[PDB]
Amino acid sequence: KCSLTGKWTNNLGSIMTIRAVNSRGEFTGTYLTAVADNPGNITLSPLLGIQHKRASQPTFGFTVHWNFSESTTVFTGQCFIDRNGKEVLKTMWLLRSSVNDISYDWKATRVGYNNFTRLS
Amino acid sequence: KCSLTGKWTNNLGSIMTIRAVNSRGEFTGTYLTAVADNPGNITLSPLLGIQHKRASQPTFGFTVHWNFSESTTVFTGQCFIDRNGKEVLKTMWLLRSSVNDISYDWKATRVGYNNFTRLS
Amino acid sequence: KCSLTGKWTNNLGSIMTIRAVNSRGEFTGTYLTAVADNPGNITLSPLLGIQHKRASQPTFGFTVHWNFSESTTVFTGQCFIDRNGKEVLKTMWLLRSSVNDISYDWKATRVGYNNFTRLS
Amino acid sequence: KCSLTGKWTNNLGSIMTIRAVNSRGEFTGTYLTAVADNPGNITLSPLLGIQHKRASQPTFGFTVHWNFSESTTVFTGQCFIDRNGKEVLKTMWLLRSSVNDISYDWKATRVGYNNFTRLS
Numbered sequence: 350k351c352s353l354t355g356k357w358t359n360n361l362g363s364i365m366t367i368r369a370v371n372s373r374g375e376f377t378g379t380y381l382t383a384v385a386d387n388p389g390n391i392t393l394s395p396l397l398g399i400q401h402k403r404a405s406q407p408t409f410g411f412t413v414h415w416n417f418s419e420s421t422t423v424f425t426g427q428c429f430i431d432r433n434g435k436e437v438l439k440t441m442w443l444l445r446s447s448v449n450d451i452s453y454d455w456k457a458t459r460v461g462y463n464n465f466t467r468l469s
Numbered sequence: 470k471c472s473l474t475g476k477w478t479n480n481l482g483s484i485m486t487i488r489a490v491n492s493r494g495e496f497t498g499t500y501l502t503a504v505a506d507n508p509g510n511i512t513l514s515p516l517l518g519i520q521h522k523r524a525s526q527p528t529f530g531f532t533v534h535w536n537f538s539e540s541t542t543v544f545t546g547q548c549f550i551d552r553n554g555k556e557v558l559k560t561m562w563l564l565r566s567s568v569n570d571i572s573y574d575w576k577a578t579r580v581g582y583n584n585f586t587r588l589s
Numbered sequence: 590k591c592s593l594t595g596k597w598t599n600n601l602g603s604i605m606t607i608r609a610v611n612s613r614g615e616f617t618g619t620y621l622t623a624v625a626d627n628p629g630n631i632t633l634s635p636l637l638g639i640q641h642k643r644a645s646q647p648t649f650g651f652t653v654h655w656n657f658s659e660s661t662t663v664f665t666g667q668c669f670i671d672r673n674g675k676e677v678l679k680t681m682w683l684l685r686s687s688v689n690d691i692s693y694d695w696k697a698t699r700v701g702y703n704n705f706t707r708l709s
Numbered sequence: 710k711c712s713l714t715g716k717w718t719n720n721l722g723s724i725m726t727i728r729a730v731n732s733r734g735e736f737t738g739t740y741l742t743a744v745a746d747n748p749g750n751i752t753l754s755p756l757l758g759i760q761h762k763r764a765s766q767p768t769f770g771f772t773v774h775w776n777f778s779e780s781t782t783v784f785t786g787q788c789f790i791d792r793n794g795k796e797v798l799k800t801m802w803l804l805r806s807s808v809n810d811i812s813y814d815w816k817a818t819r820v821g822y823n824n825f826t827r828l829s
């Protein structure tokens with residue numbers, strides 16, 4: 350089994366902590382990004398998500414509410430286990446910027462990927 | 470002020486209901502999709518997300534844990550208000566499928582958009 | 590049969606003109622975007638793409654080499670025809686910005702959608 | 710400088726050849742994917758794209774017309790050079806499937822990433 354609970358780092362150097370996953374697969378956590386539009390502003394930021402509970406290699410999603418900008422990121426992915434019991438989170442994300450009005454909506458969404466492994 | 474609490478529909482005919490947004494911008498809800506890989510299986514499914522609280526046109530994200538498949542979707546976007554006080558959510562999404570192992574990860578993520586307006 | 594040759598506009602007000610499609614499904618064209626990072630710089634820009642030839646509702650892709658910035662956009666989608674012979678292109682796109690070095694790669698890709706209908 | 714001309718492999722094991730880039734940045738090539746929806750059907754497939762010509766680390770895009778399915782993929786990205794002169798293509802892609810009619814359009818687009826390095 351592949352619980353999200355724990356500490357994780359990604360390929361950019363970001364650090365994420367996921368707390369207890371409840372019986373509905375819901376979880377809270379924190380996220381310290383290594384990169385940002387204005388990296389001097391970075392602070393620890395909250396996340397909230399849901400994973401599938403029963404699956405051995407569950408899919409999941411979470412939202413990061415950045416505390417230092419008007420942006421939001423969502424991540425979705427799957428937790429995989431090796432033959433050796435090593436876990437990897439393979440994810441993709443959408444990063445939504447705040448724009449002034451609906452005419453700028455077209456430019457407000459960035460896309461990318463991240464792989465996470467456990468810190469311990 | 471552009472608020473998420475209430476009932477919404479999107480351009481595909483899906484319905485979502487978001488409950489009270491707390492002081493941290495967190496919300497729960499339910500999502501009834503009009504479409505699926507197997508539309509005969511569709512059931513009402515829970516969501517969990519976060520919005521920015523203070524912005525008049527906030528960005529937000531949420532995760533939908535589909536109750537009828539192993540997939541997960543995340544939505545992110547922004548709530549816009551026009552002259553008349555009419556609200557629209559402009560969103561993009563990632564839909565993560567469950568695959569058997571990490572060698573299939575490349576095909577596991579679909580992307581799309583949705584616009585939502587209030588229902589009743 | 591759903592063909593790409595001709596003039597089109599999308600939901601943002603951009604105009605594109607596609608020339609003759611050859612026997613391999615290749616086409617050239619021009620693209621006039623209604624929006625940009627710096628809309629004061631916009632100029633008419635070339636495109637190059639490929640469609641499937643034999644399908645009645647073909648999928649296709651094309652690249653737009655913006656003549657006024659260091660960015661590139663790719664569009665992919667499908668041409669649909671309804672009962673009346675009315676054609677619509679449903680597309681998604683990736684807009685790649687130029688960044689200074691590989692450490693900024695994570696922020697370099699925006700995503701979005703466009704629907705196109707014929708002009709004249 | 711970072712010409713696309715040459716042979717490249719990606720992180721999935723796919724092989725791509727890009728032929729001469731003309732004075733407008735346009736190029737043809739071939740692509741042998743290591744993976745597919747139906748990998749038993751895979752055959753060598755054509756691509757067509759454009760890169761920026763003058764930039765030392767150009768952005769670019771290309772379209773792959775798959776010869777063995779009704780799908781199309783577009784790739785966009787940037788060519789980066791190391792301090793040692795080693796080139797890497799960092800890309801993202803959209804893979805468009807053919808669907809029967811417009812009501813299924815929502816499910817027709819997959820997204821992902823690939824990094825390429827030179828074969829020689």
Ligand SMILES: O=C(O)CCCC[C@@H]1SC[C@@H]2NC(=O)N[C@@H]21
Pocket residue numbers: 359361363382383384385386387415417418419420422442444461463695
């Ligand atoms: O720049 C901002 O306003 C908020 C921080 C965004 C950080 C993004 S989220 C996707 C990518 N993966 C990370 O670990 N960090 C970046």
Ligand SMILES: O=C(O)CCCC[C@@H]1SC[C@@H]2NC(=O)N[C@@H]21
Pocket residue numbers: 479481483502503504505506507535538539540542562564581583815
């Ligand atoms: O097919 C599944 O396994 C779960 C349902 C997926 C529904 C998607 S989520 C994105 C798009 N927007 C909708 O309202 N429904 C579809």
Ligand SMILES: O=C(O)CCCC[C@@H]1SC[C@@H]2NC(=O)N[C@@H]21
Pocket residue numbers: 455599601603622623624625626627655658659660662682684701703
């Ligand atoms: O801003 C730039 O540097 C180049 C212009 C980008 C225009 C984008 S491409 C996607 C979207 N669809 C359009 O018709 N225009 C925008």
Ligand SMILES: O=C(O)CCCC[C@@H]1SC[C@@H]2NC(=O)N[C@@H]21
Pocket residue numbers: 575719721723742743744745746747775777778779780782802804821823
């Ligand atoms: O499955 C198909 O019908 C066509 C082949 C798709 C292969 C995709 S394109 C994106 C990804 N990167 C690759 O090198 N191959 C896959």
Ligand SMILES: *[C@@H]1O[C@H](CO)[C@@H](O)[C@H](O)[C@H]1NC(C)=O
Pocket residue numbers: 358359360464465466
């Ligand atoms: C991400 O994956 C790459 C390629 O497998 C690997 O080299 C790297 O260690 C991974 N990063 C993390 C934090 O897991």
Ligand SMILES: *[C@@H]1O[C@H](CO)[C@@H](O)[C@H](O)[C@H]1NC(C)=O
Pocket residue numbers: 387389390417418
């Ligand atoms: C973020 O960075 C910008 C540019 O330095 C600064 O002016 C702004 O006040 C910062 N905002 C926050 C929330 O830290």
Ligand SMILES: *[C@@H]1O[C@H](CO)[C@@H](O)[C@H](O)[C@H]1NC(C)=O
Pocket residue numbers: 478479480481584585586
């Ligand atoms: C979505 O936007 C379209 C295009 O503007 C509009 O016609 C429609 O009313 C919107 N649909 C919903 C359900 O909000």
Ligand SMILES: *[C@@H]1O[C@H](CO)[C@@H](O)[C@H](O)[C@H]1NC(C)=O
Pocket residue numbers: 507509510537538
């Ligand atoms: C969904 O649909 C498939 C195909 O009809 C069916 O076999 C399966 O049992 C259904 N799964 C669930 C959990 O609803």
Ligand SMILES: *[C@@H]1O[C@H](CO)[C@@H](O)[C@H](O)[C@H]1NC(C)=O
Pocket residue numbers: 598599600601704705706
């Ligand atoms: C795009 O689709 C919308 C929503 O159906 C429609 O109202 C509009 O006519 C289309 N726009 C263009 C320019 O094709």
Ligand SMILES: *[C@@H]1O[C@H](CO)[C@@H](O)[C@H](O)[C@H]1NC(C)=O
Pocket residue numbers: 627629630657658
């Ligand atoms: C585009 O706009 C910027 C900002 O106004 C300007 O400085 C620059 O010269 C322009 N670039 C080109 C090549 O059009």
Ligand SMILES: *[C@@H]1O[C@H](CO)[C@@H](O)[C@H](O)[C@H]1NC(C)=O
Pocket residue numbers: 718719720824825826
């Ligand atoms: C892709 O990048 C990863 C991480 O840097 C690297 O280990 C791998 O060798 C690269 N693959 C190719 C084909 O360049």
Ligand SMILES: *[C@@H]1O[C@H](CO)[C@@H](O)[C@H](O)[C@H]1NC(C)=O
Pocket residue numbers: 747749750777778
């Ligand atoms: C692709 O694979 C399927 C499933 O094996 C097969 O039935 C079909 O004929 C193949 N199509 C092509 C174009 O090779």
